[PDB]
Every structure is written in C-alpha cells, then in structure tokens.
Amino acid sequence: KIPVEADFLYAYSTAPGYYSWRNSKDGSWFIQSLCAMLKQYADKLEFMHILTRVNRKVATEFESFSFDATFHAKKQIPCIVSMLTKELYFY
Amino acid sequence: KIPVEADFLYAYSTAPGYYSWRNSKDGSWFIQSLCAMLKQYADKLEFMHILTRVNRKVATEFESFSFDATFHAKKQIPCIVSMLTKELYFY
Amino acid sequence: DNSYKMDYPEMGLCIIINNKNFHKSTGMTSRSGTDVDAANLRETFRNLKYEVRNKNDLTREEIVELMRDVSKEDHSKRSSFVCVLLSHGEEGIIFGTNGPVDLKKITNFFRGDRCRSLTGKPKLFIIQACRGTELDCGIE
Amino acid sequence: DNSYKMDYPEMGLCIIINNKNFHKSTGMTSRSGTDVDAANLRETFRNLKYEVRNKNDLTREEIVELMRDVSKEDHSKRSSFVCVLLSHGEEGIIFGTNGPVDLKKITNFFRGDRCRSLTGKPKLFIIQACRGTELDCGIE
Ligand SMILES: *[C@@](=O)([C]S[C]C1=C(F)[C]=[C][C]=C1Cl)[C]([C]C([O])=O)[N]C(=O)[C]([N]C(=O)[C]C1=[C]C(/[C]=[C]/C(=O)O[C])=[C][C]=C1O[C][C])[C]([C])[C]
Numbered sequence: 001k002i003p004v005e006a007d008f009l010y011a012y013s014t015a016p017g018y019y020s021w022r023n024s025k026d027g028s029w030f031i032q033s034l035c036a037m038l039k040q041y042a043d044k045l046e047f048m049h050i051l052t053r054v055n056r057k058v059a060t061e062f063e064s065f066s067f068d069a070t071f072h073a074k075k076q077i078p079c080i081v082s083m084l085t086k087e088l089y090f091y
Numbered sequence: 092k093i094p095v096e097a098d099f100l101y102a103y104s105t106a107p108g109y110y111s112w113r114n115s116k117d118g119s120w121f122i123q124s125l126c127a128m129l130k131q132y133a134d135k136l137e138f139m140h141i142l143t144r145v146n147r148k149v150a151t152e153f154e155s156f157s158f159d160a161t162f163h164a165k166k167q168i169p170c171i172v173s174m175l176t177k178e179l180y181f182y
Numbered sequence: 183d184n185s186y187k188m189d190y191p192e193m194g195l196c197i198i199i200n201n202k203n204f205h206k207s208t209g210m211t212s213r214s215g216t217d218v219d220a221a222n223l224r225e226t227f228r229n230l231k232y233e234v235r236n237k238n239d240l241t242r243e244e245i246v247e248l249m250r251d252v253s254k255e256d257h258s259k260r261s262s263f264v265c266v267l268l269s270h271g272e273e274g275i276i277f278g279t280n281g282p283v284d285l286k287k288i289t290n291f292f293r294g295d296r297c298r299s300l301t302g303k304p305k306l307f308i309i310q311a312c313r314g315t316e317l318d319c320g321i322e
Numbered sequence: 323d324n325s326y327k328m329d330y331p332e333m334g335l336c337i338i339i340n341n342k343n344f345h346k347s348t349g350m351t352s353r354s355g356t357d358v359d360a361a362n363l364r365e366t367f368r369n370l371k372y373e374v375r376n377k378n379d380l381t382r383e384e385i386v387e388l389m390r391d392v393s394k395e396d397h398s399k400r401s402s403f404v405c406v407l408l409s410h411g412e413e414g415i416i417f418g419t420n421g422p423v424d425l426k427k428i429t430n431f432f433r434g435d436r437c438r439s440l441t442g443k444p445k446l447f448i449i450q451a452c453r454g455t456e457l458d459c460g461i462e
C-alpha cells in the first residue's frame with residue numbers, strides 16, 4: 001500500500017511563474033539541452049543527476065537576444081519536481 | 092551571469108494540495124525519516140539520492156491511525172523541487 | 183531495492199503532444215521551433231526503447247481523451263511512462279489548439295489508484311511551457 | 323565542476339523556525355510533536371557543521387524580518403544555506419503564530435540578485451507543512 005500521488009516526476013521547462021524560452025531554428029532551450037544530455041549520460045548517470053546538468057546547461061549557456069527592450073537578455077532556469085521513491089537508470 | 096531563481100532547492104513535507112502528517116510522540120513523519128537518512132548517508136550519497144530514499148521511507152513505512160473515519164488510514168508522499176545546477180555532497 | 187525495476191520486456195511508451203498552431207480565438211501565437219523539438223525528441227526516446235506516438239495540435243477536449251485512452255490500457259508488461267507536452271501555457275494550465283486546459287485532470291488518470299498497471303512504475307512527465315510572464319534578468 | 327563547492331571555512335547557517343502555539347485568533351491547533359522535531363533537527367545539522375539558530379513561535383511579521391535580517395549578512399565565507407520551517411500551512415502559504423504569510427516574500431531576499439554572497443551557493447529550504455486538505459487513501 002502506497003501514496004497514490006507518488007512515483008510521479010515532473011520536469012518543468014522553467015521556474016514557476018516564469019516564461020519558457022524557444023529558438024526558432026533549434027527550438028526550445030530546455031528540450032534541446034535535455035535530449036543532448038540523455039545523448040551522453042543515458043547510461044552513465046541516474047536521471048536527477050542528468051536533469052541537474054540539464055539545469056546548468058540551460059542556466060549557464062543560454063541567454064536571450066532580441067530587439068525588444070523587454071524580451072531581450074533574459075535567462076531561464078528549469079524546475080525538477082520529484083516524488084519518485086527510488087532511483088532511475090534507463091538500462 | 093545566471094538565473095536569479097536558480098540554485099534554490101525546496102523539500103516539501105508532502106505533495107502539493109495535500110496534508111502533512113505528524114506523530115505526537117516522535118513528531119513529523121517527514122522530519123524524523125529525513126534526519127535519520129542524513130544520519131546514515133550524509134557522506135555516502137549525494138542529496139537528491141538521500142531525499143529520494145526519504146521519499147520511500149515515508150511513502151512505504153508510514154500509515155496514519157485514528158478513531159476518526161476521515162483522519163484514519165491516510166498516507167503521505169513528499170515533494171522534492173530542485174533548481175540546483177550542480178550536485179551536493181556535505182563533506 | 184534502491185533503484186527502480188526497468189527490466190520489463192517493454193521499456194514503456196513515450197507519447198509526445200506536439201502542439202503548435204493555435205486557434206485564432208485562443209489568440210496564441212504559432213510556436214516556431216516546436217517542430218525541431220518533437221523530432222530531436224522522437225529520435226531520443228526511440229534510442230532508449232519507447233513506443234513513441236506523436237500527436238499534433240490537439241484541442242483541449244482531445245488531450246484529455248487521449249489521456250483516458252492512455253490510462254486505460256495494459257501497461258502491465260511496460261516498465262514506465264513518459265508524456266512530453268510542448269505548447270503554450272500558464273501556471274498549472276497547458277494549452278489546447280482551441281482552449282486552455284487544467285493540468286490536474288490530465289495527470290490524474292495515471293494516479294496510483296486510477297492507473298493500476300503503471301502503479302509502482304515512474305510516471306515521467308516533461309512539460310515544455312509558460313508558467314507565467316516573468317523574466318530572469320540574471321545576476322553575475 | 324559538476325558538484326557544488328563545499329570547502330569554504332563555514333559550512334553555512336541553519337536557521338530553524340519552530341512554530342507551535344498559534345494565536346487563538348488564527349484558530350490554528352497547537353502542534354504537538356513540533357518540539358521533538360526541532361531537537362532531532364538542531365542535533366542533525368549540528369553534526370554537519372551549521373550555525374543553527376532556533377527561533378520559536380514567530381508571528382508572520384517576524385519571520386519576514388528575521389529573513390531580511392538573514393539575507394542582509396555576509397555569507398561570504400559561508401558555503402551554503404538551510405531554512406527549516408515547521409508550522410501549519412496552506413498551499414504557498416505558511417503560518418505565523420498570529421497570521422498566515424506568503425512564502426514568496428520569504429524566500430525572495432536570498433534570490434540571486436538580492437542575496438549576492440549566497441549567489442551561486444545552494445539555498446536549501448525545508449518546509450514542514452499543510453499544502454492543503456487532501457488525504458492519500460493509498461493503493462496496493
Ligand atoms: C509561452 O507559451 C508563452 S505563454 C503567453 C501567455 C498568454 F498568451 C496568455 C496567458 C498566459 C501566458 Cl503565460 C512560450 C513558450 C513556447 O514554447 O511556446 N514562450 C515564448 O514563446 C517566449 N518567446 C519566444 O520563445 C520567442 C523569442 C525568442 C528570443 C530568443 C531566444 C534565444 O534563445 O536567443 C539566443 C527572443 C525573443 C522572443 O520573443 C519574445 C516575444 C515568450 C517570451 C513569449
């Protein structure tokens with residue numbers, strides 16, 4: 001017998017209340033930088049450990065550019081919510 | 092230059108929208124079962140890895156008891172939100 | 183033990199809900215790039231062994247059904263679950279190609295006592311969207 | 323590199339905000355057990371090397387100040403941060419021993435561009451409370 005709302009893992013593209021960014025030629029920052037990590041560590045790391053490097057590769061190497069005063073020079077930081085009651089290792 | 096809302100880590104005592112439990116003789120389920128893990132793995136594991144076993148030790152071995160119809164036989168499941176952009180190892 | 187059980191015959195099923203063009207009514211701008219994602223994605227979970235089924239531009243009453251269509255299904259021999267949603271959004275709300283829709287009702291079917299074959303297995307939800315209208319000016 | 327930098331002279335500072343008795347007005351029941359925690363806690367972070375300062379039953383206008391008192395402070399030589407809050411609560415709201423208080427305003431001082439010495443360091447918030455009034459009947 002376990003908690004129903006358990007084992008659920010949600011990886012939001014940004015921090016609550018904030019906007020999520022997107023490139024018109026590569027697409028999302030969050031999605032490209034995510035797949036790219038599962039590209040390297042899909043069998044090396046756990047998953048939170050992946051999702052965390054994904055957090056850095058999006059908080060560190062991504063910065064908006066725009067001719068708009070408001071929509072320019074803006075950052076983004078993902079959100080890793082986890083209820084999982086165990087580790088995960090795709091393999 | 093980084094995202095302000097970053098590096099923040101919030102460990103909620105339950106799942107959003109839900110109640111949090113408490114023992115009158117040991118205290119919180121979430122707090123006792125947490126310290127107890129940092130008691131064993133404060134230098135063995137990372138932290139998400141700790142916080143996850145904490146998730147199990149609270150989703151698995153804790154079940155409410157009460158003479159009330161409503162406040163009896165209820166479970167709880169913690170919530171690990173993470174913005175951290177790196178790993179953590181207290182030592 | 184400590185780590186999940188992932189040695190079931192079928193790794194899972196990775197439905198991606200690629201939403202891009204929004205009903206003029208919704209007033210939601212057409213997301214350019216969404217496509218580049220859905221492909222880099224479909225290719226990603228294909229390499230990890232998931233049954234990826236891509237659906238495009240689905241109204242609110244449509245994502246909800248697919249979901250009950252997906253919860254009710256023998257995931258018995260399936261090891262896990264992955265739902266990738268790419269669309270516009272607010273906080274707690276995701277968007278249909280016709281109207282905004284409450285996230286709660288979506289994820290609910292797969293709840294421990296509603297989706298029992300998935301019970302004990304990890305429901306991995308990846309949301310790609312607007313949790314509001316705040317900007318990170320960045321320090322350092 | 324990959325893992326945080328924790329080899330600063332001072333591991334951090336672990337303020338625990340032990341709230342238990344609530345102003346009859348608030349109507350919040352007196353939490354029995356809270357104390358057993360605050361002790362098992364103070365003893366825990368004491369062993370990991372934190373400057374633990376325990377404050378008890380602080381009204382809403384009181385937790386907020388301590389916080390600006392805590393954000394404004396040279397955490398320069400400090401490696402990290404930990405705020406343990408034990409009290410009643412709703413979703414997004416925590417309770418004072420006089421009145422409910424918005425979580426956002428609390429955590430905000432330590433934001434990258436507000437609390438600059440903590441910048442780059444992990445702000446570890448542990449909340450022990452009622453995110454609403456839902457029960458987990460449990461399956462299996
Ligand atoms: C969100 O879905 C927008 S939700 C808007 C909204 C409503 F209309 C009504 C009620 C609530 C809300 Cl929250 C999308 C994310 C998505 O995947 O569709 N957010 C955006 O589209 C953002 N704009 C862009 O991504 C376009 C853009 C990109 C860049 C440069 C990026 C870069 O990486 O450069 C190197 C600069 C400027 C823009 O345009 C911004 C208008 C939001 C900022 C709208």
Ligand SMILES: *[C@@](=O)([C]S[C]C1=C(F)[C]=[C][C]=C1Cl)[C]([C]C([O])=O)[N]C(=O)[C]([N]C(=O)[C]C1=[C]C(/[C]=[C]/C(=O)O[C])=[C][C]=C1O[C][C])[C]([C])[C]
Pocket residue numbers: 110111112113114120154155156157162350353409410411412413450451452453454455
């Ligand atoms: C929450 O703070 C309650 S918030 C209530 C609330 C309002 F009054 C107004 C607006 C919004 C909200 Cl959310 C506390 C958590 C805390 O740390 O103080 N929750 C509780 O106190 C729960 N009750 C108990 O913990 C007491 C209790 C324990 C048990 C047995 C536990 C066990 O482990 O047994 C082995 C059984 C019954 C009860 O009593 C329940 C009335 C909530 C359930 C109230």
